[PDB]
Write a protein that binds this DNA or RNA. Structure first.
Length: 45
DNA sequence: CCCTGATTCGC
DNA sequence: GCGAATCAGG
């Protein structure tokens, strides 16, 4: 439910594949599409 | 209605 | 650092 290194790795892979924030949120669990978009920004993607 | 990312700022 | 709740649209 937190941005572990494992979950960040998954986010980067899926985002760089072009999956939408809601899709990634559903894959990960424990986060909304808002959380995903916020994290994408803090990662500088 | 379903959906998209972007931003602010209290927490 | 985190993410809800707008914003701004498709």
């Amino acid at each position: 439910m937190s941005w572990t290194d494992e979950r960040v790795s998954t986010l980067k892979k899926l985002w760089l594949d072009g999956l939408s924030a809601s899709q990634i949120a559903k894959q990960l669990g424990g986060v909304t599409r808002n959380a995903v978009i916020g994290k994408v920004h803090r990662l500088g993607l």
